Amino acid sequence: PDLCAVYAVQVRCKRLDGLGYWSNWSNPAYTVVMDIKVPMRGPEFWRIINGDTMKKEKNVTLLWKPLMKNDSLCSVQRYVINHHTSCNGTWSEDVGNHTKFTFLWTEQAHTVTVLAINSIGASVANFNLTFSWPMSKVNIVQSLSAYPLNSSCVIVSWILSPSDYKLMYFIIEWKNLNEDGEIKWLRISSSVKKYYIHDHFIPIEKYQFSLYPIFMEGVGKPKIINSFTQD
């Protein structure tokens, strides 16, 4: 089941015809943790946009988490970010062991892909995210609401308007408005309409919940709420 765990193996032998006993086990042989295949799936990444609305150029900081043993298999030597633009074409920038990378967004459409590379090669299944200025104005989430079940779970529900664009998946972004905590995000399927976010939530403190509709053309206009619905 696991291709990168240490396995103890002991072997013993006897005659095929069965006349006798069965001997004791041999010395245990242990596998050496080495790369067997290329990584199965690339890391999920999200963007932080730093820039005034009056500026055409915005700093996009991509944050991704290190891959688990299921996705990284054995290890990830480095991460490389491949860019896709209508003007500059396709180029790849090596990030290395860093889990964050800041670049500049200037063009109308920019596709970003993250690949995890080990001693054998790059990852097979890699997530791509498209940044598009016209697509940022498309809003399909008619309404969004949050209900605190307790300090450890919050129900987030949304009602969507019909859209001509193909909706791929949702990305829920939440953070604390009373503290300078890290901006948390989670990728959910587009067919999901209500989700149970399990985190330490304080009902007194205000939490900003942002829902980002993701499409083939790019990220849609997020629906943002700043407090739990008391109705």
From Swiss-Prot:
Task: Give the top-rank taxon of the lineage listed in the UniProt record for this protein.
Answer: Eukaryota
Record remark: domains: The cytoplasmic domain may be essential for intracellular signal transduction by activation of JAK tyrosine kinase and STATs.
Q: Into which family does the record put it? A: Belongs to the type I cytokine receptor family. Type 2 subfamily.
Q: What residues are glycosylation sites in this protein?
A: 24, 59, 88, 97, 128, 150
Task: Please give the tissue specificity annotation from the record for this chain.
Answer: Isoform A is expressed in fetal liver and in hematopoietic tissues and choroid plexus. In adults highest expression in heart, liver, small intestine, prostate and ovary. Low level in lung and kidney. Isoform B is highly expressed in hypothalamus, but also in skeletal muscle. Detected in fundic and antral epithelial cells of the gastric mucosa. Isoform B and isoform A are expressed by NK cells (at protein level).
Show where the Fibronectin type-III domain sits. Answer: 39-132, 140-231
Q: Which disease is it linked to?
A: Leptin receptor deficiency: A rare disease characterized by normal levels of serum leptin, hyperphagia and severe obesity from an early age. Additional features include alterations in immune function, and delayed puberty due to hypogonadotropic hypogonadism.
Which portion of the entire protein is included? Answer: 601 to 831 of 1165
Q: What is this protein's record name?
A: Leptin receptor
Q: What does this protein do?
A: Receptor for hormone LEP/leptin. On ligand binding, mediates LEP central and peripheral effects through the activation of different signaling pathways such as JAK2/STAT3 and MAPK cascade/FOS. In the hypothalamus, LEP acts as an appetite-regulating factor that induces a decrease in food intake and an increase in energy consumption by inducing anorexinogenic factors and suppressing orexigenic neuropeptides, also regulates bone mass and secretion of hypothalamo-pituitary-adrenal hormones.
Where is the motif (WSXWS motif)? 22-26
Q: What is the effect of changing residue 4 to G?
A: In LEPRD; uncertain significance
Q: Indicate where this protein resides in the cell.
A: Cell membrane; Basolateral cell membrane
